[PDB]
């Protein structure tokens, strides 16, 4: 089997990406942000506090035929960015882009943060990670791409993510006609539960290229690119009049201007990010100072290619026994 579905931005700023899922029977379809940095299929549903939705569309579970309460099973989680929501958990049918799981854990909010209940336009995530991060407790569940992993054509899913522009999330085959050029494979450590891996190096716009080790994972809900202070630094040294701004909370720039792309490496392959992919726009309304898109990892732990860096490319995230990712232009 395969499955096919378009990811759009919610906002002009490619803040993130939601793609359409059908859970239940009959379906009640949900906008979800697909996030290959964790590991839970959760959504606002019939259970949210009243007070902690606002406009989001909800899971009922009580109006579909296939939904079952997984008894006794509790979830809860803490995303990078200080965001948190927790529950109980049902089965149920899901469908994405025509690819359907029976049974699948969809993991019903009964509390979510403040930065959820803001955004509308997310009605819930669908991790992509390695099932070993799922939060439910006490028996683990497995995420829809591990569930769909054996009836795929291939063991694979690909993101295609757009600048500015809706993109695709295929599951179970490479669309060949998609990229240009090849598709460079490279090493996946899963021992944290991400697609953890090593780029090899990086260039600043038209500069030389740097061949260093820079591991990191890749995580499509993640906005930004998150690299360490040192890459950071030789970035945004390339910008006149940008700074780190603790008020802010890390590197503005004159909204004036032009962008220099960024260049990552994988295995002898390069990903060229272009310098307007890297404009996350003015930090509050009208303003002139504008947030930039690269930013430092310092104090995270870790390396985040996120969309910034992932939309520059058609991005395999190959589930064989030992997995691996492949980046193409595009």
Known sequence: ??????????????????????????????????????????????????????????????????????????????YGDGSSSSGDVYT??????????????????????????????????????????????????????????????????????????????????????????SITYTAVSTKQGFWEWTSTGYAVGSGTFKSTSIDGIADTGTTLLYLPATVVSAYWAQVSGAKSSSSVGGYVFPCSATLPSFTFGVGSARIVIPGDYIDFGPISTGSSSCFGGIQSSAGIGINIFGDVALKAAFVVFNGATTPTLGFASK
């Open 1 to 78: 089997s395969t499955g096919s579905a378009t990811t759009t931005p919610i906002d002009s700023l490619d803040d993130a990406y939601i793609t359409p899922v059908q859970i239940g029977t009959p379906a009640q379809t949900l906008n979800l942000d697909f996030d290959t940095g964790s590991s839970d299929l959760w959504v606002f549903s019939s259970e949210t506090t009243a007070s902690e939705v606002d406009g989001q569309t909800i899971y009922t579970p009580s109006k579909s035929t296939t939904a079952k309460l997984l008894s006794g099973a509790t979830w809860s989680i803490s």
């Open 92 to 181: 149920d049918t899901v469908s994405v882009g025509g690819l359907t799981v029976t049974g699948q854990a969809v993991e019903s909010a009964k509390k979510v943060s403040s930065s959820f209940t803001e955004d509308s336009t997310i009605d819930g995530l669908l991790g992509l990670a390695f099932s070993t991060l799922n939060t439910v407790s006490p028996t683990q569940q497995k995420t829809f791409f591990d569930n769909a992993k054996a009836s795929l054509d291939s063991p694979v899913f690909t993101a295609d993510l757009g600048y500015h522009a809706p993109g695709t999330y295929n599951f179970g085959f490479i669309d060949t006609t998609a990229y240009t050029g």
